[PDB]
Every structure is written in structure tokens, then in C-alpha cells.
Amino acid sequence: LRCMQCKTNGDCRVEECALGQDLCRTTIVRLWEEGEELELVEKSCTHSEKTNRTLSYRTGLKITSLTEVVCGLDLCNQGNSGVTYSRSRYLECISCGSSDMSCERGRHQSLQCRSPEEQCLDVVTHWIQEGEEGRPKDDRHLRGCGYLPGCPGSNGFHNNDTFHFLKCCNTTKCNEGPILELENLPQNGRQCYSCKGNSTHGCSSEETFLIDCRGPMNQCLVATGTHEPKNQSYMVRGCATASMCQHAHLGDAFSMNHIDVSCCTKSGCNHPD
């Protein structure tokens, strides 16, 4: 079992697809502004949990087609991906981002999908202040055409310090309207436990505290696996939805490897125990 490794520049060399990931993923970003237009390659190996994805976002007069694909077959990613690639124009949607504060200012624009199953989504990312450098560079908000894993319908997670979220649906103009602010959401009634950090002093019995979950995440979630640059012995706590329990859509977002989630019905099932 093996794969290919290509940088962004694309030094095209190989790997053993290591072990914990059997998956060769090809990863691509498409930028378009005015007439001219632009694009990007990363071929590497990625964990089993991963599945194909599109998500094109519109920042105003420039548009960003992201997208990624997986195969596990020894050695897929060299050459191409998968005469006009966007054949036709499929379902309509609204798109804007916090790149320019696009989704924030009411600038929502019409952006046709580049394919038929590609749908409307509000996807949301907040952070507290700083995890690392001031935290990951993903837009505090984004909306437009795509397909995200298990997107059909809705999903996400939350607690005192971090808010992630995902909306989507197959209806025209479904994502439109206001911006999901969290604090905007309703009171799900669930009582839970939030925390970040190591066995102790990140996550310990102390910092932990009771938080009111908001919105559709009435599920109390918790997770573990290795994190960014190999500081392991790491976990997370907070309310969320079914989504984050099956598979992990958590494993994409928080960026961690061969993690495992579990969740509990009645509130406060959250505690390290």
C-alpha cells in the first residue's frame, strides 16, 4: 500500500502512504478573478475517514473553487483529477465570505454551482482568540456552492471557546438570509462540559465547566487522537450534533488523526468521569 506526494509548487515524489492513512488524496484550489484565472495542486496521503469535497466560495468579483478527492488504490494522484470540465450549470446558491467580510456586510451574491449535487451552505468558523498564532486562517464565515462530507442537512459543534458549523440543502437560495452568529441560535436546553488541553491543565477536572449548548447541537461530544505537529495526549469537550459522532467531520476541521468520538444523551454526560 502506497501513494504520491506533491507539493504546491509540486515537487513530484512519493511516500509509503505511511500507515495510519491508506488514502491518497488529491487536493485543489481554483481562483478566478475577472477574465484571468489561477490554480493549485497538493497530492499526499490522508486518513481513511476522508471523502471527496468541493465548496466554491465567492469573495466578491473573485471566486474560489476549492475541492479534494480520494482514492486508496496504490498510486492514484499523479496527473489529473476529475471539452469542458464544468459541463453545464447546475443548482443556484448564494455565496460570500469573511475574506472581505463578504458574508458579514450583506453583499451576498448569486453564484452558480459548477456541478449539480453541489449545494447551498452557510459554513461557520469562529475561534476564541488564539490557539496557536492567533488561530487557523479559515474565514469566520463562508457561504456558497459545494459538497461537504455528510453535508446533506446540517451539522457542527460548539462550546465556550470554539464554534464550528455547517449548513446545506438542495433548495435554490436555501442558505440566504442572515449570518449564523451562534449567540443568535436558540437554547437547546442541554447542559454540558467544555474544555481544551492536555490530560491535565488543558482538560482537567478544574477548567472544565458547565455551559449552555445552543442550537441543534443537543448532543454532548468528546474526542481524542493526535493533533497538530505531533503533540498527542489531546482531547475536546462540547455540545454538538449527530454528525460529529458518526465518522468525524470533527477530524477534518480540528485537524487530528485517527481520533474517536463518543457522545451522551442526557446533559452533563460530558465529564471526563
Partner: antibody, heavy 119, light 113 residues
């Protein structure tokens, strides 16, 4: 440090009423369901109840006869027990503890409560 | 109201000696969540009581391995190899798996000298 400190001891004229505190520091108080346990006969052990700072729930054990009132202060980080009409069998040790959340099942306790009544 | 009945009710042990108490519950003690709250809480004399175990195995922070929790169903078992002077005190088992909560008897421990 998990800290539970009750009122000290109290004497009471039978049939009348008593108020016995419970204290804490050592957590976000709002974050745990509180209890009380009757230790009676210097021996036998029996559940009083639960109550729960955030949502404001209150349990009372069936046999209680609701002589009992849990209660709280959020600003004080404090549990109470208002516990009216009193008796001979009553006299015992009364402790409090944390669950928590929900799911009954305690961990840390406080010292206890010295409580008895007579003529 | 389930029954909490512990045995032996009368037990002295000698240091470095085996201590096995056993607790019983009328019905099961397993909540619709598929977990079991049954536990072990000790009162060490002249102090205030403290949680030795919960969840029928899982041990509190400053709790040493010398204790081992067990059992399932209507039956349960507690275990300690190295018995010591700390272990002098009173021994109670309670299940948080029904309201109202239940308390075992009070099995009492000594160290023979």
C-alpha cells in the same frame, strides 16, 4: 481544591425548624448537582436529595415528606437546606455532595452536619 | 427503592491481608444509558467520608490500585490485597442508578494487630 463546609452544629426544639448551610470553592459551582445524606443512628445511611444551580432542579426522596427545601445563592457559591417540622428519629448527621451533572452519583463531600432535637 | 446489602457486615483484616467485600442490589443497577453508577464510598473515622470508587471499577484520583472494583448484575465485588491502616474506617456501597439513591449497610473494617 474541592471544598465543602457546612454550618457547624445546631440544637432544635422538636416540631420546629432548622437552617444548615453548605459551602464551596473548588470549581465553577454552577457546574454541579448537590446532595444531602442522612447518616442516622450514627450508622444507617439514607439519601435526602439533589439540586442543581444552573437549571434549578430539586429532588426530594419520596419518604422525605417534603419537610425539606433545598435552595441556593449564586453569588455566594452556597447550598442551603431549609428543613421544617422536626423529630426524634430525625436526629442524625447530614452531609452534602456533588454529582455531577445529572446522573446522581457523588464524589466529594463536606465535613457534615450536627443535628439533633429534644426538650 | 432498591436494597443495598453488603457482606461481610463484620470484617477485620490483618495488614498485607486480602479484603473482599461484596454488595447486592434488588434489581439491576444499569441505567438506560448503558453504564452503571454503582459505587464505593468510605468514611475514615474522625474525618469526613470520601469517594473510593464509582462505576463499579473506576478509581478516584488519589486512589491507589490496591483496590479493585468488580461485579455486575445484582451482584458486585470489591478487592484489596495490601490492607493498611488508612483502610481503618467504615465501609459503605451506594448505587446512583435509581432515584432515590441507595446506601449499602456500613461494612466496618479493622486491622488485626
Amino acid at each position: 481544591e474541592v471544598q465543602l463546609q457546612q454550618s457547624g452544629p445546631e440544637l432544635v426544639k422538636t416540631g420546629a425548624s432548622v437552617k444548615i448551610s453548605c459551602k464551596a470553592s473548588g470549581y465553577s459551582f454552577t457546574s454541579y448537582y448537590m446532595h444531602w445524606v442522612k447518616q442516622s443512628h450514627g450508622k444507617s445511611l439514607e439519601w435526602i436529595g439533589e439540586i442543581n444551580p444552573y437549571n434549578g432542579g430539586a429532588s426530594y426522596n419520596q419518604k422525605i415528606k417534603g419537610r425539606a427545601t433545598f435552595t441556593v445563592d449564586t453569588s455566594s457559591r452556597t447550598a442551603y437546606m431549609q428543613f421544617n417540622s422536626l423529630t426524634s428519629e430525625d436526629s442524625a448527621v447530614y452531609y452534602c455532595a456533588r454529582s455531577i451533572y445529572g446522573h446522581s452519583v457523588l464524589d466529594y463531600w463536606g465535613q457534615g452536619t450536627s443535628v439533633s432535637v429534644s426538650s | 427503592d432498591v436494597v443495598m446489602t453488603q457482606t461481610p457486615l463484620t470484617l477485620s483484616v490483618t495488614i498485607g491481608q486480602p479484603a473482599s467485600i461484596s454488595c447486592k442490589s434488588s434489581q439491576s443497577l444499569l441505567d438506560s444509558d448503558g453504564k452503571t453508577y454503582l459505587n464505593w464510598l468510605l468514611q475514615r473515622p474522625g474525618q469526613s467520608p470520601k469517594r473510593l470508587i464509582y462505576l463499579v471499577s473506576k478509581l478516584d484520583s488519589g486512589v491507589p490500585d490496591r483496590f479493585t472494583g468488580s461485579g455486575s448484575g445484582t451482584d458486585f465485588t470489591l478487592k484489596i490485597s495490601r490492607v493498611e491502616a488508612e483502610d481503618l474506617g467504615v465501609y459503605y456501597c451506594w448505587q446512583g442508578t435509581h432515584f432515590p439513591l441507595t446506601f449499602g449497610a456500613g461494612t466496618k473494617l479493622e486491622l488485626k494487630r
